[PDB]
Design a protein around this ligand. Structure first.
Ligand SMILES: [Mg+2]
Ligand SMILES: [Mg+2]
Ligand SMILES: [Mg+2]
Ligand SMILES: [Mg+2]
Ligand SMILES: [O]
Ligand SMILES: [O]
Ligand SMILES: [O]
Lengths: 82, 28, 141
RNA sequence: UCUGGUGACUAUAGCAAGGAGGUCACACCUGUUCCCAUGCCGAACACAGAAGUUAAGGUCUUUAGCGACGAUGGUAGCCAACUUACGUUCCGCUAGAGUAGAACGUUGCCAGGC
RNA sequence: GACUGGGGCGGUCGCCUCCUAAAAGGUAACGGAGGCGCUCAAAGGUUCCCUCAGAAUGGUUGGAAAUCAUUCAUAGAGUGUAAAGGCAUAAGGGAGCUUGACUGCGAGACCUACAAGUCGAGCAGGGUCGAAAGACGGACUUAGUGAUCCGGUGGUUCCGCA
RNA sequence: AGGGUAGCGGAGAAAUUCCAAUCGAACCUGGAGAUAGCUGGUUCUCUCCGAAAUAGCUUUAGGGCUAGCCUCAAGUGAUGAUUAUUGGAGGUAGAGCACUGUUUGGACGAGGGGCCCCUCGGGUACCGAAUUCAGACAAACUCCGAAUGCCAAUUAAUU
């Protein structure tokens, strides 16, 4: 009946709000984040710096562009605003 | 402690800056 | 009731599957085989009973297979309870059958005795059935 | 476009097998006095040499046996709409995977020898 | 004391990772699986160097378990720690030297009701490694935690009831 | 009959019983219009606009606060919305076995266990893994991977 007697598993509010935070064809400012992740689900290219949680940003203004490298693993690479 | 003679201790259970002579020192 | 066919769990609780549709899964081993056609899924107990039948009525040995195995449990919890609390204990195992699987297959016999044993099976399962000959797949490469 | 060094390209480059050549490339290679170095060891790294050789590494030729690529067609599924409560059906977008066909024994840039 | 498939007994009350979660995020349940309330003076930083588990066979220690020995071995190992993500130029394993586990800051972005949290190129000071470019503001990533008031210890360009 | 004990009390052969028809602590006045996160009630017409029933925290869940969602007056000034076109992040449906783990029947040889022969070996049903043929299964497996949606466009039409 009621109560008897169990777990209570369930630790259900556990959130961090990852993902992507910009898109291709998007002007962007220095210091701005593009894409949170972990490990290297995306690598950086040019005009980029990474951080102590595998975040990504742009050291300099420009225009975001993702790319392919080796049939598995991508990379992101700002290129110069004209 | 320090040999700038002022308590700075990031410890719990050494040749480095201390901001009184711009040097780096023991502490300790 | 009885659950002879069993395995290492890997986990004892699982969200169910409930069937929608498919075809396919032709015969590959024997000659004659049973095709499930319609609305249900299965427990092991049933399959065992069907095997008892299909082994008796065929003397002369006569070969049988079961192309499927229940990889899935079937949970059902204490008697006369209020709902709510944690998912219940194990009672059963399951082998889902969309319309198009081929449960039972045989060879070594003629066309008749097969067909009888298969009648005597399909009365002992939920699903409507159909009798089939191995003449063709829908692909041979 | 012969060789070599360095770059770019989704392994169509690869992997397995076999054939051929070297004192101009490179390599094996002789040796450890010095540079230096091996947790034992000049095997490795490194320095000094060029005695012998194409065997190996590496280069070129050919192979489609392995792996990667791979359409077109039609199928499952599904966005929208009509019926319907039917483990739904009919109609209009879209369009997989698996698979056959076929493709594949790389392609180009810069320098320097030639 | 609240939840509470009436209430009670039972169980839980915060945080980290997954799945349910519907190809961005977010998204509950007395739904399903696991943990944390630390550890390190090197397991940190930096310059160099190297590549494993497994398998085959011969050999003392013979579960072929111990080190050897080559060959095959596309990462099946290992990654301080729980799981997902990640890594082979290594983020793993060893050697040298050190101790950036620094000071003052911080444009600009995420997140979110708020309070809090997260990341941060770049400037200057003054230094470690390295030949030099260059790298370093803790640990591959995330959890390892506690408002304010009050009390205490040290310091000081502060005030101090004529 | 005449008298006493008076409520933070008295009396009680004790039942929480009696104390001016009332007693889990009488009665009247005053504090006092006590308090109420609760129920109930709220008075004359028209016109314009127009929701929500969620997130978080809450000795909180039928209350509250902030954000959402509305209205009004200023301000901004085409920034918003739908569609088309291009690009793009993720990994569901589906499919599949290349890792994880499950599984059936073969092939099986690497080799064993006894019962038995030998007595150094033969080992004659079951098997591990060895290697493989074919066929299957999955929210917490993925070599793969749709439709939809989501993010932006010194882009275009409508509004
Ligand atoms: Mg009395
Ligand atoms: Mg009143
Ligand atoms: Mg409000
Ligand atoms: Mg499925
Ligand atoms: O009142
Ligand atoms: O009142
Ligand atoms: O009142």
């Amino acid at each position: 009946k009621k109560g008897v007697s169990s777990t209570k598993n369930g630790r259900d509010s556990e959130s961090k709000r990852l993902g992507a935070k910009r898109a291709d064809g998007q002007f962007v400012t220095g210091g701005s984040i593009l894409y949170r992740q972990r490990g290297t689900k995306i690598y950086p290219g040019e005009n980029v710096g990474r951080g102590g949680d595998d975040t990504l940003f742009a050291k300099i203004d420009g225009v975001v562009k993702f790319e392919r490298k080796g049939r598995d693993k991508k990379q992101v690479s700002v290129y110069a605003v004209a | 402690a320090c040999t700038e003679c002022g308590d700075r201790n990031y410890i719990t259970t050494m040749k480095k800056f201390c901001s009184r002579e711009n040097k780096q020192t023991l502490h300790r | 009731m009885l659950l002879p066919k069993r395995v290492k769990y890997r986990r004892q609780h699982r969200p169910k599957t409930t069937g929608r549709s498919k075809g396919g899964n032709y015969v590959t081993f024997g000659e004659f085989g049973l095709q499930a056609t319609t609305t249900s899924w299965i427990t092991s107990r049933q399959i065992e009973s069907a095997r008892i039948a299909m082994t008796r009525y065929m003397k002369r040995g006569g070969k049988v297979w079961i192309k499927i195995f229940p990889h899935t449990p079937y949970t059902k919890k204490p008697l006369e309870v209020r709902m709510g609390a944690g998912k219940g204990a194990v009672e059963g195992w399951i082998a889902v059958v969309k319309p198009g699987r081929i449960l039972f297959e045989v060879a070594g016999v003629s066309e008749e005795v097969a067909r009888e044993a298969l009648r005597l099976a399909s009365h002992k399962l939920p699903v409507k059935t159909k009798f089939v000959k191995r003449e063709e797949l829908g692909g041979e490469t």
